Design a protein around this ligand. Sequence first.
Ligand SMILES: CO[C@@H]1O[C@@H]2CO[C@](C)(C(=O)O)O[C@H]2[C@H](O)[C@@H]1NC(C)=O
Length: 166
Amino acid sequence: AKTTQEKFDALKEAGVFSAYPGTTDAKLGQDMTRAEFAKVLVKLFGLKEIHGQYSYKDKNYDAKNWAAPFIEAVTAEGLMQAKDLTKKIFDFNGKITVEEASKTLVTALKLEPVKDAQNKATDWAKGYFEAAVNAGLFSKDANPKANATRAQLVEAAFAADEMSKG
Ligand SMILES: CO[C@@H]1O[C@@H]2CO[C@](C)(C(=O)O)O[C@H]2[C@H](O)[C@@H]1NC(C)=O
């Protein structure tokens, strides 16, 4: 049974995960931005980067933003969307939460959100989070509302990859 560090090392060699920005450290206890996680999803699921399209109005979300091709890909794929459909705000620099990551992976894996889900998650996410817990993507005592640690994201990505091979 691989450790989180072993899983990270496998995913890093595969080009799916990177070290913590500006370092060579895995920093498994640190958090991850929504921008960085969009890139993880693109690499994990083999999505095509989308250049020259901008679906959001966040300040400094434009052609100079390195993450736009990744964010656009996960948007086109239906994995991520805005937090605010009026102002069209993705919150690219906000940290990805456990329940947000759960939605992306449940969606990519074509798992059914759980009806009548009763758990700690924000209302919109209860079904997604429950499906992710039931599939072993996050541990049962993970806080859906917390920022996901890099460890948790490695564990979840690794399990998603295992579920995508066949
Ligand atoms: C606060 O609104 C929620 O925002 C969530 C942000 O995280 C993800 C995973 C996303 O699509 O990026 O899920 C979003 C939720 O669907 C929800 N957004 C909307 C428009 O209902």
